[PDB]
Design a protein around this ligand. Sequence first.
Ligand code: A1CZD
Ligand code: A1CZD
Lengths: 172, 172, 69
Amino acid sequence: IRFCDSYNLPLVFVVDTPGAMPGVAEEKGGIIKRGGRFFNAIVEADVPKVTVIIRKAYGGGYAVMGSKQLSADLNFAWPTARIAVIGAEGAAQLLVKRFPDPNAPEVQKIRDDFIEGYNLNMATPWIAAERGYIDAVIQPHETRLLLRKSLRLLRDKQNGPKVQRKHGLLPL
Amino acid sequence: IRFCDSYNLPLVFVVDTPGAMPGVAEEKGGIIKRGGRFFNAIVEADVPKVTVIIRKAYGGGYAVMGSKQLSADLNFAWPTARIAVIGAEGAAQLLVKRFPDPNAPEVQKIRDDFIEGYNLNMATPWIAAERGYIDAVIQPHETRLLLRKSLRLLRDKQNGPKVQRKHGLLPL
Amino acid sequence: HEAHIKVLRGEPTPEEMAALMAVLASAGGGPAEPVKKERNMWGHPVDKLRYSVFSWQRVTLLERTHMRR
Ligand SMILES: CCC/C=C/C=C/C/C=C/CCCCCCCCCC(=O)SCCNC(=O)CCNC(=O)[C@H](O)C(C)(C)COP(=O)(O)OP(=O)(O)OC[C@H]1O[C@@H](n2cnc3c(N)ncnc32)[C@H](O)[C@@H]1OP(=O)(O)O
Ligand SMILES: CCC/C=C/C=C/C/C=C/CCCCCCCCCC(=O)SCCNC(=O)CCNC(=O)[C@H](O)C(C)(C)COP(=O)(O)OP(=O)(O)OC[C@H]1O[C@@H](n2cnc3c(N)ncnc32)[C@H](O)[C@@H]1OP(=O)(O)O
């Protein structure tokens, strides 16, 4: 991203991710700072930023992959997109851990019902579209020509207001 | 270094290092890109940079710890300084790689004669001083008032010529 | 925690103390109102220089000179 920004290439983000990796090996590997640098580079860059979401956009994956809240210019989703803080299985684990172990199959049945309701409601394009976090939900075939139209509009983007200074500091 | 440059604090380097730490774990840990970032930050910084060398300043340690070649402004060494590509023991082992029968009686003699010669003639302040890679060799007690005189001279330093641009890229 | 005047050798009488302090107080010349002077950047030297369109001194000299306060 920093290279493309330095040479003025527009950025296209194609999003399909559960977000950051879990685990102690990735924590000790530095995932907090490396993600922080990815977030930094995406906000730093001044070039046109256009995003297409395919299926999953959970948590930090949604945020970092050119979210509108992180200054992306135009954001589109395919109707398969799922934009949420966490996927249904993860929310189901946080729900069910408030119950005892699933020795009674009522627990399994509650998980299955919750996961279907969640995949019908929270984990959909439609809340982000209703709130305007994404600008449109598009038929997949529109994507190529809609990218042409969008980047023709954005060709002369001037990023601001930004305060000139020696440099922006970066997580190191 | 990047933070200090952003808030215009002058930088004082107090060198005493054999350089980068050898090992496969350090290689796998990213030591080339991390060292390249350290090299990048030292050159990028515009603030006054003053260096005092104590004792060892070998190889990349010499270079990265505010050498004159990497844009340090004033360079001083105590008479204990030792500036070289590699320390005496490393140069000796690099020679004993030839005719490498380290069980032999005489090789352990010529090793010590070489190390004596190398620590007298090579790993010293005096070649860097006579070539002007460092600006003075000083009595240690001079250091505090010398640093005052130097940073008072450098108080208004303007760094240039530099070409203004969006940003400088760095190893990442 | 203030730095006081000190007399290091001998002791003056109260009359000599008063004369010493009185003459030193008289020697205390100055503006009579030392405060931060009014800022006026009109025609400051840094605006007079030619800067190349890409010169880094446009950041580290011109802008910092205007913005510093
Ligand atoms: C010159 C120009 C220069 C320019 C320079 C430019 C540079 C600037 C760049 C700028 C850089 C950009 C900066 C970044 C951008 C933003 C990115 C952030 C967005 C995300 O990336 S977003 C991730 C997705 N986000 C989670 O996973 C959280 C949740 N998921 C997890 O996995 C978490 O690991 C965890 C630990 C939180 C989950 O675990 P838990 O939630 O801590 O615990 P639990 O559920 O067991 O507690 C019980 C629960 O029930 C309720 N409750 C009832 N009673 C009680 C009680 N008595 N006590 C406690 N709770 C109670 C309550 O709800 C509680 O939850 P809680 O109290 O709310 O926590
Ligand atoms: C606004 C925008 C701003 C942005 C700006 C920012 C950007 C700025 C960035 C700034 C960037 C800063 C850059 C700072 C540079 C770093 C400092 C460099 C100094 C050093 O930090 S340090 C030098 C390097 N140096 C050693 O260390 C010696 C110690 N060394 C070692 O650490 C290793 O071990 C190794 C691998 C290096 C040595 O490797 P090797 O020992 O050379 O290799 P070998 O013996 O296997 O083969 C060859 C030898 O053997 C003979 N030989 C064998 N086989 C054959 C054959 N088939 N035919 C013929 N001859 C043969 C031959 O004669 C030869 O001889 P020789 O030994 O080469 O003389």
